[PDB]
């Protein structure tokens, strides 16, 4: 067996948010449009069909899922639309599967693999990982407005680089462990998925630095565009069709630490990728090359870079217990997983990183 | 700008046909299941919240059959069009669903073309002369590939599939070098290009292994890889990167009666080799592609598609149809004229006859 | 975790059978020296400490393990000594573990990986695979008289190459599936073990043609010595320390067909190795090179080379069911193992080999 | 035309395996004399059908101690000698096992040398001057390596092991080029198995040494540490016994005549002696340099000053060289013509070359 899933339609073009309504119309009659707080005003202005606009509470947790879900039943919504980062998108997704509504995602930032996948992640109200839901349907359409996306602070693009950085390495773990992907109901990876995942790593090495340099200067270039697709299309297609591993599992456990709450999903995953490499005891040169790559774009490569500086061995112990709960994605790793091993991998990565100047 | 499209689900596993009903249920309530004739009886048995009407497929994706089949959907009030056959069945279904606003599920019974995954349906005259490639606004909702069903078909169909998939990387490279748009048509996505390229590697790695396997009536991982490459890889590459002279020459070849009995992919395999000549690629790349084609038994000379009499005049005719304004062959990164096309084809046959 | 096991002493020199007692002396005071039938007469004469000499029956099966055991108890046997092929040795080992006797193996042919290993394989009285006993000790000394091994017909040396050939490939299956080896109840493979399995393949491709040609002309050269070592020491260490997989599993299943009874362990395993490759869908070039390598020394590469020619799909169905019993070694393969998957891999390999 | 291989009957490497050691003794005898290093005697005697007398090691492998232990064993009527310590504890245990007809089990507490596997026990004068290397007729029955116990020692002991494993391949290569016999059964050419193991040892060190060091300095046990523990114990032990020693162990032996070098570990001296071998055989500049750099990456000594040797150096090196070149010594396995000046001068030249890097 083997199985692939992806969005019916991915489109990436500057200004495309002005024509967003024109993608909704063929899909439903009643659209609930959910828009991150910061941009709720201008994108309500700017966006046979009526739109209810709702404002997004910031976190993907049960209370907000529920609020928005109740909004939708009353609306009678045909279509859930997510217009924000990954938390907004996942919320629209979860509300959609629950409603029977079609899904459209228009990211406003390229900071995570969430917009393309069938997976939605729920946190507590304090942003502690709760549960990854494997949905049955990918989105109907993903509509990325490059200009919009390239306008955000530079840190949002770098954080997507760091989340996309896990893709190839985590696919490599699932191939070596022969573990299923989350494409419903879960199956071995397709050659298609393996290729996307491999190619995602290549696009990042070729363009990341050039893209980071360009957004910092308020510019939108072909390098930025390549990175937007790598952060969004290649990464989501990869992670969904190949599987997650210890990079994401370590992101999950990192969420138990409060000091970490203000760092982006993509920066924790970047750090978690570096830990996956040490856990699987990869080549020193590969680990060092990834460390230098992360440093070159400003992603974290030491515990200290994610605010973890006091009582570190005890904290990491907590991170590792939470990652290692029976059933978790970290068990996709072609290594024998114990808490001591995951805890000692994170600390060893940290130390080895601390020795590189 | 860039765009990527594909089906929402692709699932490939032995036995899946028996579970096809269960992929229809989440999509609607009234499914119209269009099946190829050879298999109508047996597949209607196995396929039969959800209500199905089964129809027999005539064989051509032509207007009389499309419109005949649409009238049957409107009566049934169908929610879901299911193509169950080869690429004509598939394309028939897709065009009806779009005309009907129904959802689309394809369940191929052979792995002989890249039709099952794409937004492209090709309509032929009732005789099988190319009329029109319709760019549809949706891709399939699900593609459900039953590996055992596909594998037990005569080897020729898997080989015709390798033939069709062979155009993928080479056509994508044609499109990437002319910066023409993929078929809802934008420049190619990175994902698209990476898919296309990978398709060529899977074929070279596994093609001879698969062929040998199916000729002995076996299903192996080499077969499964080829089935994926013939359907998922080939389909995603072609839509997301574009087609070129290989399919143009295919389409041109349809104007000749004596080619009618050959499989789409056998025609496309020949056209790929002509594409290489048209673009004047390396002697060694052309030769190795000729040798790869012969090793699985795909055609490499005009005589292999039976064209043996009045050849220049016929190839002239083929080139004319291929070169009509607006056609896909203009995606070639070369200056396309009817002589260039006609002489590439003849040149390729000449060069192939010299090996 | 990781573990390694091996014999305590491995000595390989022409004429060493004359010195066998000198190796027994320190191991005990009373040795039962089990010898194959062909060589029973000559080697007993050639071979302080007293030794009963028991003739060996041919099969390592329970009726015959028990016979030899009784003799051992009667003897008061201190050291079990196995002088012959793999079956002779497996018996001797099994008796030894039953008795708490020490172990010495003195192979007279280099046709299998048995002499160094902790593994004894039991067959039915008619030679159908029964059970792979994993023993708690390796031999105390393995003593290899090169001159005696190289004097045997060339077929026996080629059968060892056949067996050794599976070592790297089956090690690789186990590494890629992370399956426990056969050391002390089973652990991950040691680096030492992986290095040995790897080198085994290197010595075989380097020296197997030259050794085959040397033994056919009646010669003992350094290339023969190298192959004797790989067939015995490298191949045993690699197998025991890295594990087996579908190549031995398919050999085991082949044992159920009568027509294959005549072929040697090694020629069966050789063929199973090619099947493992097809089963893992390994690169075509690699499958081809190993086919050409098997033909260049006369090892089987088709179903017909094993006598399998009538009703083949049904017979391979049977070999596959037998190989795919629950808990069998074939599951060490980094592939999803089913009877159809195994059956069609053997068939596919057969078809692919028939087209070269 | 002849070859031979010898090795331990079992080698087991797992964290906490010290607790189960008694379970490995049962099958070999009824009566075990357990000889433990000074530092861990208390703690390990209490962690460790069967009757065991416990004895604290003197700390040097020398005749007074061997005799003493030997009398303890006879009084006890020991069936098994177990050395639980470093290579001296191990080597004392073996000599007494062979004089006593006991079986031999070794449970290293540090991975500081390649003694635990081999049939070679080295005797020193009471003050630590090299005295005799005895080739025993038997290898250990079992080597039991408790990875947590070994990894919790100070980093210097693992670094010292790496120094001693570093010589394995270089000395096998000397012995292959001079076609000198090994120390298996009276002496035979290297088996292909021995040669492969020794070469592999060197690959394991280079891949994993720096990651193992960083890890144990952080008080961690990771897979790099596991690999290096095997490299220092199993690989280096099999390689050495099966291919022979040369001038690296010869220069080590000579060094022990100098009082000042007394506080330096066996493995730190062998590291330096291996660099000297390379100069003695006039190996490639780039190979000598890459080893120097490699020793420095893990903090092994690469100059005479690093062994504290800074006054009257030519004269002292003169004394080191005389002692190594005593007739019959293992330095004669080097594929160079061995004289006192050649060795004296290879050492000095290596130092001078190393000061220029
Ligand atoms: Zn993510
Ligand atoms: Zn086509
Ligand atoms: Zn065998
Ligand atoms: Zn040493």
TrEMBL record, chain B:
Question: Is Repeat given among the entry's keywords?
Answer: no
Which residue ranges does the record assign to the Alcohol dehydrogenase iron-type/glycerol dehydrogenase GldA domain? 7-146
Q: Name one Pfam family in it.
A: Fe-ADH
* InterPro entries with a match to the protein in the record: ADH_Fe/GldA, ADH_Fe_CS, Glycerol_DH
Source organism per UniProt: Rhizobium meliloti (strain 1021) (Ensifer meliloti)
Q: Its encoding gene is what?
A: gldA
Query: Is the keyword Glycoprotein assigned to this protein?
Result: no
Pathway-wise, it operates in: Polyol metabolism; glycerol fermentation; glycerone phosphate from glycerol (oxidative route): step 1/2
Full protein name:
Glycerol dehydrogenase
Q: Which reaction does it catalyse?
A: glycerol + NAD(+) = dihydroxyacetone + NADH + H(+)
Q: What is the lineage of its organism?
A: Bacteria, Pseudomonadati, Pseudomonadota, Alphaproteobacteria, Hyphomicrobiales
């Amino acid at each position: 067996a083997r199985a692939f899933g992806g969005p019916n339609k991915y489109i990436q073009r500057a200004g495309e948010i002005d024509k967003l309504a024109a993608y909704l119309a063929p899909l439903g009659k009643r659209a609930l449009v959910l828009i991150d707080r910061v941009l709720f005003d201008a994108l309500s202005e700017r966006i046979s069909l009526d739109i209810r606009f709702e404002r997004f509470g910031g976190e993907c947790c049960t209370s907000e899922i529920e609020r928005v879900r109740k909004v939708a039943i009353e609306h009678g919504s045909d279509i859930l639309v997510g217009v924000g980062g990954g938390k907004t998108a996942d919320t629209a997704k979860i509300v959609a599967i629950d409603t029977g509504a079609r899904i459209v995602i228009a990211p406003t930032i390229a900071s995570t693999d969430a917009p393309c996948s069938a997976i939605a992640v729920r946190y507590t109200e304090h942003g502690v990982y709760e549960e990854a839901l494997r949905l049955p349907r990918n989105p109907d359409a993903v509509v990325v407005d490059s200009a919009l996306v390239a306008a955000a602070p530079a840190r949002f693009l770098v954080a997507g680089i760091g989340d996309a950085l896990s893709t190839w390495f985590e696919a490599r773990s699932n191939i070596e462990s022969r573990t299923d992907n989350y494409v419903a109901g879960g199956f071995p990876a397709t050659e298609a998925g393996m290729a996307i995942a491999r190619h995602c790593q290549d696009v990042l090495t070729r363009d990341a630095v050039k893209a980071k340099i360009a957004v910092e200067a308020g510019l939108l270039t072909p390098a930025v565009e390549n990175i937007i697709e790598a952060n969004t299309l290649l990464s989501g297609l990869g992670f969904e069709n190949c599987g997650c591993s210890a990079a994401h599992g370590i992101h999950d456990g990192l969420t138990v630490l409060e000091e970490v709450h203000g760092y982006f999903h993509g920066e924790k995953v970047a750090f978690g990728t570096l830990c996956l490499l040490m856990l699987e005891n990869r080549d020193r040169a590969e680990i060092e090359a990834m460390i230098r790559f992360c440093r070159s774009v400003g992603l974290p490569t030491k515990l200290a870079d994610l605010g973890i500086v006091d009582d570190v061995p005890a904290k990491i112990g907590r991170v590792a217990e939470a990652a290692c709960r029976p059933g978790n994605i970290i068990y996709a790793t072609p290594v024998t997983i114990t808490v001591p091993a995951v805890r000692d991998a994170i600390l060893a990565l940290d130390a080895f990183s601390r020795s590189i100047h």
